[PDB]
Every structure is written in structure tokens, then in C-alpha cells.
Task: structure prediction
Amino acid sequence: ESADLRALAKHLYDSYIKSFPLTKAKARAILTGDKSPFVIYDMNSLMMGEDKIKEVAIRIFQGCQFRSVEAVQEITEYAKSIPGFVNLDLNDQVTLLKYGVHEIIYTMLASLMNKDGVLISEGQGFMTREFLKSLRKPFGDFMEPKFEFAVKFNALELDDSDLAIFIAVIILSGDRPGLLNVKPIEDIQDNLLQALELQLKLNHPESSQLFAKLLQKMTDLRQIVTEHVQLLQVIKKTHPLLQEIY
Amino acid sequence: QLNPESADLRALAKHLYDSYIKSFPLTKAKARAILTGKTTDKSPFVIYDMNSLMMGEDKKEVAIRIFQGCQFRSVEAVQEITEYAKSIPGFVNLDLNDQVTLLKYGVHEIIYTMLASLMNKDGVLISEGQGFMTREFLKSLRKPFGDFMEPKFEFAVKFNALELDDSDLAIFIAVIILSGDRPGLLNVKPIEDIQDNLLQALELQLKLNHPESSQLFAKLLQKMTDLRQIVTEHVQLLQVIKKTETDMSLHPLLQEIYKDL
Ligand SMILES: CCC[C@@H](Cc1ccc(OC)c(CNC(=O)c2ccc(C(F)(F)F)cc2)c1)C(=O)O
Result:
């Protein structure tokens, strides 16, 4: 048992590294100790950042969308490396990605966040929490709850090897609506959960019940996603091919 | 056997086939099974005249109604193609303006490539394969509507002789989207680097899938000139329609695609 699992963990770490350029380890190095990122903390600072790297709030939102669309392709590539994933019914793969990417985006965004701001543009920029929060409604309230989640998530002190398995657990959720064959999805998730548990026991022997605590974070994640989607709807009180891409 | 480099190309081929099946709900495989009688469950209702057309409805003017139907389907196809385009590695990382440009010039060449899958020399599948409208009925519509589809049929018959399957088409459609010689492109190099890779993958795919088909790769690439000619002829036909039929509406997505094409 405890060998297929080590294999699974290593396999997923290696694939996570290929798929996601900006790892947590590299993000934390930048957020602390070498060559500093460009800090966007103001309206004038944002203006200059676009030279270095509609009005203002709209351009920032549209930027997050371009990045999210990129991230969806990175996550999809990652998914296809999870053993058993490509052997699932194709409708079910599409369903799992459709309902999983938002949860994964915000999980991974926490790797680029501290309590004072978030890394952007592959770590070249840093947009402050206070700047994002100052944006006029409804655009001032879209990142804040991701910051509150991130602070709580980051207290677990997970590393990229832990996160690789956790992301996979998220993708293989058998409770997504419209799934046709739930059995093999839950069978794969069981194996991934086993791998995650062992990974966290070996990697974090002094953090009691880290496995449990990580799983409980799924509750705040789905909350964040549901309220985000409702903000996206409210956004409909504010180029044809361009809107098609998004 | 295969080597590391040709192995990466196979993975690319498989990724693109997989995304094609997820993005396009009516494949060539399904279209051929409907057209060739692999069926008591999948046979289409045939529209060959006005009364057939009437009877087909439970499933103004006839020429305009069919034309409005094509427009609508064209808008759907653009949505499907745009979703496919996102899956092509590197595409979403390109400059946003270039993504729009590649789609603008790409989508119709792709629409007509895939339309061939739904066609034989006698007609075309419609309404997700539930109906089949004859080439003769379409050709009989009052001018200039009777001219719209004939060039698509001529191309299709010649294109279908290549006997490409969906795994082949998936890489070819990607090659179409990622052309660095589209007008107005800001950053050509990254586009060409992606197409290089796509071309290598198409080439190997055609060698493996059709080993007895000499220069299929070259012959398929040559067909890109036919697609371009179809697009241009089609656009000149729409300008005539827009002027003779002041009461007919062209969808803004389609209008933006054609704007200064
Ligand atoms: C004016 C609209 C013409 C299109 C070109 C076009 C796009 C898609 C097409 O179908 C895949 C076609 C050919 N039309 C059909 O196959 C078709 C015909 C009738 C119907 C309908 F009757 F069901 F509506 C649906 C599709 C043309 C364009 O210029 O964008």
C-alpha cells in the first residue's frame, strides 16, 4: 500500500511542477527574501505597471479573467496527469473540470497571497490588498474574501508537494452535478486521499490532524466560490469575439 | 519505434483529439454513421422540397428562413471553435488582441472544413443530424440564395476524398487557427512556434493513421487554399444580400468577424 502512494505523491508533484510555472516555494521566496516585484498600490502605480509589465476597476477585473482563462488550461493539463482521469467518461471529465477550476484557482491563489497583497504576472508584480479593497463597488469586494480565505489557508503551511495531491482530491469530487459514472471518480479520490494523508504525516509529523484540517477548508472554499459566482451575476449591471473567449 | 520528440507529438495529437470531442457535439464519425445507414435509430428526415420542409418544422419566406437558420448555427459554431481554440497549448497565453485576430480570420475556414463532415454530394445534415437537406433543394432557392451552398458542396466532395477522420481534423483545425500570416498580428513569432509544433504533430498523425496515403499532409495543406477561396466568395455573396434584402438581419458576432476582413 504505502509505496503505490509514495509513487502517486511523487508523480503528482512532478506534474504539478511542469503545469504550474509559479510554484508556492518560488512565490514565498518573492514575498519575503531576491529582486523585488513591481508594487501596484495606487492609481498612478497601476498606470505605470502596465508599461513595465475602460476606467480602472474594469481593467483590473478583465486582467483577472485573462489570467483565470490561462489557469484553466494549466489545471486541465494537470488533471490529465492524474492516474485514471483520462479513462473516465469524457462528459464526466468535462464536468469535473467545469465545477473544480474555481475551487482550484482560489486554492492556488493563496500561494501567491499574504495578508497585504497578491503576486501577479508570474511574480513580476504585486498588487496590494488595500488598493483592491478601495475599488468602487462591486469591484472592491471581489478579492477581499479570497484574502480572508488565503490567510486561514496559509496558516496550514502546506508546500507544493502537499498541494499537488490536494488539488487532485478537489478535481476528483464525485458530488458534482450531472456526473454519469460516480464510482470510478470516488475510487480515484479514495486513493488520492490515502496518498494525501500519508504525504502530510511524513512531511508534517508535528502538525496533528493536518489532514482533517485541510479537508475542513473545503467548506470555506465552496462558500467563496458560491459568493464569487453571485458577484459575477451582479457584475451584469456594468468586442464580441473577446466576450466569447470569456 | 517512436522517440522522445515524436512521443511529445503523439501526446499533443491525443490532447487535441480529446478537446475536439468535448467541444464539437456532432463529429465526422457520427455524421458518417447517420449518412451511411449505420442506423434504424439515427436516420434523418429528408428535406428536398417545400412540403418536406413544412413537415420537417415540427422537430415570411423559405430562402430567408433557411439563411437565418444558417446564421444561427454559424454563431453556435463560432462558440464551439472558440472553446476548442482555448485548449490549443499556448493559445490563451498569446497577446489578447492576437487571440481575437486568429479567431476572426480562422473561424470560417474551420466552419467550412467541418461542414464537409456533414456533407456528401447529395446534401447536408442539419439540426444536429436529425435532418438532411438536399443539394438540389438548396440550389433551387431564388437568387442569389441558390448560389450560397454550391461552392461548399464542391469543396466538400474534394475534401472528403482525403478520408480524414476526427483525430486528423482536430490537429488540422488547430493548424488553421494558429496562422502567423493573418493580417494585423502583433507578435508573429510565438504564433509560428506553436504552428510549427502543430504541423509536426499533424504530419506524424497522418503518417501513422494513413501510412498508404502518399503526401496526404501536403495534399491537406493545399486544401487551405480552397477554404480561403470559399470564404472570399461567401463574403462577396453577403454584400449582395445585405443590399438586395434590406430587411434581413446579420448577427453582430458574424458582422464583427467580417468587418474589414
Ligand atoms: C448567413 C450565415 C452563413 C454562415 C456560413 C455557414 C455557417 C454554418 C453552416 O452550417 C454548419 C452553414 C451551412 N448551413 C447548414 O448546415 C444549416 C442549414 C439549415 C439549418 C436549419 F435549417 F436547421 F436552420 C441549420 C444549418 C453556413 C456565415 O457566413 O457565417
